[PDB]
């Protein structure tokens, strides 16, 4: 739910388009 180093949500192809911190 943001941007950083730790990924938040991943899409179908296990690709994260959001991070946390």
């Amino acid at each position: 739910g943001g941007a950083g180093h730790v990924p938040e949500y991943f899409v179908g192809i296990g690709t994260p388009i959001s991070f946390y911190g």
Side-chain angles (χ1 to χ4, degrees):
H5 306 79
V6 182
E8 272 186 169
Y9 300 73
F10 306 64
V11 295
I13 50 177
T15 311
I17 314 182
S18 51
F19 298 77
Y20 192 46

